[PDB]
Design an enzyme around this catalytic site. Structure first.
Site, PDB file in Angstrom:
ATOM      1  N   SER A  61      -1.438   7.884   0.924  1.00  0.00           N
ATOM      2  CA  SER A  61      -1.961   8.736  -0.139  1.00  0.00           C
ATOM      3  C   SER A  61      -2.029  10.209   0.222  1.00  0.00           C
ATOM      4  O   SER A  61      -2.299  11.005  -0.682  1.00  0.00           O
ATOM      5  CB  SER A  61      -3.370   8.288  -0.598  1.00  0.00           C
ATOM      6  OG  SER A  61      -3.251   6.922  -1.005  1.00  0.00           O
ATOM      7  N   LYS A  64      -0.114  12.001  -2.427  1.00  0.00           N
ATOM      8  CA  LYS A  64      -0.592  12.418  -3.750  1.00  0.00           C
ATOM      9  C   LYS A  64      -0.649  13.927  -3.938  1.00  0.00           C
ATOM     10  O   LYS A  64      -0.176  14.422  -4.991  1.00  0.00           O
ATOM     11  CB  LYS A  64      -1.973  11.814  -4.072  1.00  0.00           C
ATOM     12  CG  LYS A  64      -1.918  10.301  -4.249  1.00  0.00           C
ATOM     13  CD  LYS A  64      -3.210   9.717  -4.783  1.00  0.00           C
ATOM     14  CE  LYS A  64      -3.029   8.282  -5.256  1.00  0.00           C
ATOM     15  NZ  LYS A  64      -2.928   7.302  -4.142  1.00  0.00           N
ATOM     16  N   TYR A 119      -6.121  -0.151  -8.987  1.00  0.00           N
ATOM     17  CA  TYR A 119      -5.305  -0.418  -7.824  1.00  0.00           C
ATOM     18  C   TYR A 119      -5.549  -1.866  -7.409  1.00  0.00           C
ATOM     19  O   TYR A 119      -6.671  -2.330  -7.629  1.00  0.00           O
ATOM     20  CB  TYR A 119      -5.708   0.504  -6.674  1.00  0.00           C
ATOM     21  CG  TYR A 119      -4.790   1.632  -6.297  1.00  0.00           C
ATOM     22  CD1 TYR A 119      -3.439   1.449  -6.047  1.00  0.00           C
ATOM     23  CD2 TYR A 119      -5.300   2.914  -6.176  1.00  0.00           C
ATOM     24  CE1 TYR A 119      -2.633   2.520  -5.696  1.00  0.00           C
ATOM     25  CE2 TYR A 119      -4.507   3.988  -5.826  1.00  0.00           C
ATOM     26  CZ  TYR A 119      -3.168   3.781  -5.588  1.00  0.00           C
ATOM     27  OH  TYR A 119      -2.379   4.859  -5.242  1.00  0.00           O
ATOM     28  N   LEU A 121      -5.876  -2.746  -4.407  1.00  0.00           N
ATOM     29  CA  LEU A 121      -6.801  -2.735  -3.274  1.00  0.00           C
ATOM     30  C   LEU A 121      -8.254  -2.726  -3.700  1.00  0.00           C
ATOM     31  O   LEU A 121      -9.137  -3.031  -2.889  1.00  0.00           O
ATOM     32  CB  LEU A 121      -6.485  -1.534  -2.376  1.00  0.00           C
ATOM     33  CG  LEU A 121      -6.426  -0.161  -3.048  1.00  0.00           C
ATOM     34  CD1 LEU A 121      -7.781   0.524  -2.986  1.00  0.00           C
ATOM     35  CD2 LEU A 121      -5.351   0.689  -2.395  1.00  0.00           C
ATOM     36  N   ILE A 138       2.424   0.383  -0.973  1.00  0.00           N
ATOM     37  CA  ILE A 138       2.415   0.420   0.490  1.00  0.00           C
ATOM     38  C   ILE A 138       3.165  -0.779   1.069  1.00  0.00           C
ATOM     39  O   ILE A 138       3.750  -0.746   2.163  1.00  0.00           O
ATOM     40  CB  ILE A 138       0.978   0.492   1.022  1.00  0.00           C
ATOM     41  CG1 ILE A 138       0.234   1.772   0.604  1.00  0.00           C
ATOM     42  CG2 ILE A 138       0.887   0.354   2.534  1.00  0.00           C
ATOM     43  CD1 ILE A 138       0.667   2.976   1.425  1.00  0.00           C
ATOM     44  N   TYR A 167     -10.258   5.243  -8.735  1.00  0.00           N
ATOM     45  CA  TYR A 167      -9.009   5.560  -8.018  1.00  0.00           C
ATOM     46  C   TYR A 167      -7.895   4.630  -8.455  1.00  0.00           C
ATOM     47  O   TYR A 167      -8.101   3.432  -8.716  1.00  0.00           O
ATOM     48  CB  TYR A 167      -9.266   5.507  -6.514  1.00  0.00           C
ATOM     49  CG  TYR A 167      -8.224   6.093  -5.590  1.00  0.00           C
ATOM     50  CD1 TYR A 167      -7.683   7.359  -5.773  1.00  0.00           C
ATOM     51  CD2 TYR A 167      -7.792   5.351  -4.494  1.00  0.00           C
ATOM     52  CE1 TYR A 167      -6.731   7.880  -4.906  1.00  0.00           C
ATOM     53  CE2 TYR A 167      -6.843   5.859  -3.628  1.00  0.00           C
ATOM     54  CZ  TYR A 167      -6.317   7.119  -3.835  1.00  0.00           C
ATOM     55  OH  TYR A 167      -5.371   7.609  -2.960  1.00  0.00           O
ATOM     56  N   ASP A 172       1.602   7.055  -9.249  1.00  0.00           N
ATOM     57  CA  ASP A 172       2.834   6.281  -9.349  1.00  0.00           C
ATOM     58  C   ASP A 172       3.396   6.351 -10.767  1.00  0.00           C
ATOM     59  O   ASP A 172       4.605   6.486 -10.985  1.00  0.00           O
ATOM     60  CB  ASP A 172       2.584   4.814  -8.984  1.00  0.00           C
ATOM     61  CG  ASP A 172       2.430   4.604  -7.492  1.00  0.00           C
ATOM     62  OD1 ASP A 172       1.477   5.157  -6.912  1.00  0.00           O
ATOM     63  OD2 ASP A 172       3.250   3.890  -6.884  1.00  0.00           O
ATOM     64  N   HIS A 239     -15.022   0.351   0.475  1.00  0.00           N
ATOM     65  CA  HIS A 239     -13.756   1.077   0.355  1.00  0.00           C
ATOM     66  C   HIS A 239     -12.712   0.263  -0.393  1.00  0.00           C
ATOM     67  O   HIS A 239     -11.631   0.771  -0.691  1.00  0.00           O
ATOM     68  CB  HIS A 239     -13.277   1.485   1.755  1.00  0.00           C
ATOM     69  CG  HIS A 239     -14.157   2.569   2.300  1.00  0.00           C
ATOM     70  ND1 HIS A 239     -15.473   2.350   2.644  1.00  0.00           N
ATOM     71  CD2 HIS A 239     -13.937   3.882   2.550  1.00  0.00           C
ATOM     72  CE1 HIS A 239     -16.014   3.470   3.083  1.00  0.00           C
ATOM     73  NE2 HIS A 239     -15.094   4.409   3.040  1.00  0.00           N
ATOM     74  N   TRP A 334      -9.048  14.569   1.015  1.00  0.00           N
ATOM     75  CA  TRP A 334      -8.575  13.213   0.729  1.00  0.00           C
ATOM     76  C   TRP A 334      -7.959  12.628   1.992  1.00  0.00           C
ATOM     77  O   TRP A 334      -8.112  13.203   3.083  1.00  0.00           O
ATOM     78  CB  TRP A 334      -7.617  13.186  -0.465  1.00  0.00           C
ATOM     79  CG  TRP A 334      -7.668  11.847  -1.151  1.00  0.00           C
ATOM     80  CD1 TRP A 334      -6.647  10.943  -1.286  1.00  0.00           C
ATOM     81  CD2 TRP A 334      -8.814  11.272  -1.795  1.00  0.00           C
ATOM     82  NE1 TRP A 334      -7.088   9.835  -1.974  1.00  0.00           N
ATOM     83  CE2 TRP A 334      -8.415  10.018  -2.297  1.00  0.00           C
ATOM     84  CE3 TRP A 334     -10.129  11.707  -1.986  1.00  0.00           C
ATOM     85  CZ2 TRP A 334      -9.300   9.188  -2.985  1.00  0.00           C
ATOM     86  CZ3 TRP A 334     -11.005  10.884  -2.670  1.00  0.00           C
ATOM     87  CH2 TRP A 334     -10.577   9.643  -3.157  1.00  0.00           C
ATOM     88  N   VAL A 337      -4.242   5.536   3.853  1.00  0.00           N
ATOM     89  CA  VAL A 337      -4.647   4.296   4.496  1.00  0.00           C
ATOM     90  C   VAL A 337      -3.849   4.019   5.758  1.00  0.00           C
ATOM     91  O   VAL A 337      -4.214   3.097   6.483  1.00  0.00           O
ATOM     92  CB  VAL A 337      -4.502   3.065   3.571  1.00  0.00           C
ATOM     93  CG1 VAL A 337      -5.556   3.162   2.487  1.00  0.00           C
ATOM     94  CG2 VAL A 337      -3.093   2.994   3.017  1.00  0.00           C
TER      95      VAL A 337
HETATM   96  P1  LIG Z   1      -4.085   5.861  -0.073  1.00  0.00           P
HETATM   97  O1  LIG Z   1      -3.435   5.788   1.326  1.00  0.00           O
HETATM   98  O2  LIG Z   1      -4.051   4.450  -0.846  1.00  0.00           O
HETATM   99  C1  LIG Z   1      -2.817   3.718  -0.906  1.00  0.00           C
HETATM  100  C2  LIG Z   1      -3.064   2.263  -0.460  1.00  0.00           C
HETATM  101  C3  LIG Z   1      -2.281   3.726  -2.348  1.00  0.00           C
HETATM  102  O3  LIG Z   1      -5.586   6.394  -0.031  1.00  0.00           O
HETATM  103  C4  LIG Z   1      -6.744   5.706   0.439  1.00  0.00           C
HETATM  104  C5  LIG Z   1      -7.927   6.684   0.559  1.00  0.00           C
HETATM  105  C6  LIG Z   1      -7.116   4.579  -0.543  1.00  0.00           C
END
Ligand SMILES: *P(=O)(OC(C)C)OC(C)C
Ligand SMILES: *P(=O)(OC(C)C)OC(C)C
Lengths: 377, 377
Positions: A61, A64, A119, A121, A138, A167, A172, A239, A334, A337
């Site tokens: 991320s 982003k 998401y 996740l 990912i 979030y 995407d 998280h 920010w 992951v």
């Molecule tokens: P990103 O790395 O999330 C990806 C899994 C889309 O940011 C974190 C903070 C959730």
């Protein structure tokens, strides 16, 4: 530079010896002046290959802000508009609310993560997104961006656009919008709109040079584990559920471009993007740049806990005391992951970047608080 | 490594402090392992642009080992032969001795600099080469390589081929030979013969990216001074007369490809060539690789002063004691007038490389001696 560097190396030293970190690159800049730029530990443990200052990283991320910059550049050109319906570029992307009805979703809603999208996740196995086969970008899947977005659009929104913060896969979706606005694949559009103008030469979505990369690890005992495709790593307390990782994705040309998680880059290239955001040397119109850095969600959002809102690029620090931090109000922050964290303390002219190969210590672990504290001591 | 890194950094720190150096990139590898890879100081002082590990440099005579490898790959292929006359590819190249005879000039004579040819730089203004308008390949002239070699062939040879040693335009002659033998321009031929097989991605003859380069400076007090096209800078005592620099040459497509002075590249790419020379992993046939790293000229040639002969790529150390150096017998070494030095201490498996933007400190100055001494401390 000398005392800061001593504090930071002390932090890193401890972290390496305690086997909490395999390797990292960290940079501290102040008003465009480099105060610290160092490689730490190893890029590939098994091979004994040291980390280097220009080692490449999968950004997750940290992608982003770069892709959001691309969207804003098109907004500045008049090719996108913040209040335009997303269906102007994606005619079939019409997610519905829980009651079955279809709301308007604007480019603004998507940049701010206030559209109602989510998401995988967030809740992981057996969730809606899980049943629907929606990818967070990912992992490595045998289908393209259009197919993931079709799947996404078949899920119910979590709330009406603009009425909440969550979030999400919005970047995407915006990646696909950029492709339609530009008529280019996302890698090429990002290059044209952001990377080339800013001098970022070592970034992209697919690489053919694995020997230049930081090998990903996740937290473990008695030492971090080397990732392999297909693995599911659980997220910490508060998280989310988990993340499904594919270290090989960056090398697969058939991996769809994920605007929220899909780029690679060096530390120097990411810093070039953070500095452009911090200093806006004529990269965006002034009013659009100011809007993107202002909270557009509300402190109520608590995007990284209490005291933080969200703009067009990242969280925005609204209340330092409520967030428990020495960072000044207005700070942008920010992460990613794969084990990364960054912030821009606008009042101090400070850009701080940490890229690592250890998920999740370099994203949210004690490493990140210790280094932040070192910077402000 | 940590030890070597501290000793090397202290030498650079003092050089920078005393303003004998604007910026540099140095690399030390041992038996294939990178021990030290570091950027120091500034690439462009006036813009405040720091040196980066991937900064591009005009290579000057660091071009020669790379173009010599091109020649040797053709020899291994059977397209050239060490014993063959240059006239088999350059029929009109027929230098004469001071009596009128046209002697035999073979590929071997050129590679070793024992052909009788020379350089403007040996005598400078008013000399024979000056009178004939012969270019050393570092300045920018309005004519092509064939025209420079026509001028060169009209000068008398300094001695009979094979009878002595004298640094020369022979690699520029060989560049033309490579073009005839491959039916390609020199840049494409070097790319195919050497850079592609060795993974050298950031080198060439003509660049369109000035923002990536180290800006050339020349020695000065209180500080080094930024060069512009056409200026003349006297060489250090015992090094020759002078060099006429044209920093814009690397950006001009009409600049003929100079095999002795004409390439650009990064530190990493130069290291790839030096390592190929050092360890020869199937890049050349063993007998040819051995010949190329062997003294073909004799200690008497004193090519870097007493104790040094010459092979097909560089000087070769025959007698460390006479040379007053800690390097071991068999060491390969050469440099470049933009401010560069490199050596391969074969006995120790050591490749050591210094690229700078400061003429002549990074080529021949105290800096080179202090760095060498810290490696062996
Ligand atoms: P990103 O790395 O999330 C990806 C899994 C889309 O940011 C974190 C903070 C959730
Ligand atoms: P090269 O950089 O020089 C000729 C092209 C003039 O350097 C030699 C003298 C080591």
């Amino acid at each position: 530079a000398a005392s800061l560097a001593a504090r930071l190396d002390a932090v890193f030293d401890q972290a390496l010896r305690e086997r909490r970190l395999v390797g990292a690159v960290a940079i501290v800049a102040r008003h465009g002046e480099i105060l610290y730029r160092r490689a730490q530990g190893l890029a590939d443990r098994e091979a004994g290959r040291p980390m280097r200052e220009d080692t490449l990283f999968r950004l997750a991320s940290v992608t982003k802000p770069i892709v959001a910059l691309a969207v804003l550049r098109l907004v500045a050109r008049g090719e996108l508009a913040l209040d335009a319906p997303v269906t102007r570029w994606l005619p079939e992307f019409r997610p519905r609310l829980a009651d079955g009805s279809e709301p308007l979703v604007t480019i603004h809603h998507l940049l701010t993560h206030t559209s109602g999208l989510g998401y995988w996740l967030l809740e992981g196995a057996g969730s809606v997104y899980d049943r629907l086969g929606i990818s967070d970008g990912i992992d490595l899947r045998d289908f393209d961006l259009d197919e993931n977005l079709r799947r996404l659009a078949s899920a119910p929104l979590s709330f009406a656009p603009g009425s909440g913060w969550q979030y999400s896969l919005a970047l995407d979706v915006l990646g696909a919008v950029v492709e339609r606005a530009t008529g280019q694949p996302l890698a090429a559009a990002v290059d044209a709109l952001v990377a080339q103008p800013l001098g970022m030469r070592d970034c992209g979505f697919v690489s053919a040079e694995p020997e230049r990369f930081a090998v990903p690890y996740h937290d473990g005992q008695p030492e971090p584990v080397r990732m392999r495709d297909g693995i599911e790593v659980p997220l910490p307390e508060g998280h989310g559920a988990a993340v499904r990782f594919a270290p090989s994705r960056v090398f697969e040309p058939g991996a769809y471009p994920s605007g929220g998680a899909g780029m690679y880059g060096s530390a120097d290239d990411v810093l070039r993007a953070l500095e452009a955001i911090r200093a806006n040397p004529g990269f965006l119109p002034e009013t659009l740049a100011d809007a993107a850095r202002r909270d557009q969600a509300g402190v109520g959002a608590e995007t990284r806990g209490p005291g933080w809102g969200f703009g067009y690029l990242s969280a925005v620090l609204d209340d330092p005391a409520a967030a428990g931090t020495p960072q000044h109000a207005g700070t942008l922050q920010w992460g990613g992951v794969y084990g990364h964290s960054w912030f821009v303390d606008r009042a101090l002219g400070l850009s701080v970047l940490l890229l690592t190969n250890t998920a999740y210590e370099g994203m949210s672990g004690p490493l990140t608080i210790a280094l932040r504290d070192a910077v402000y001591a």
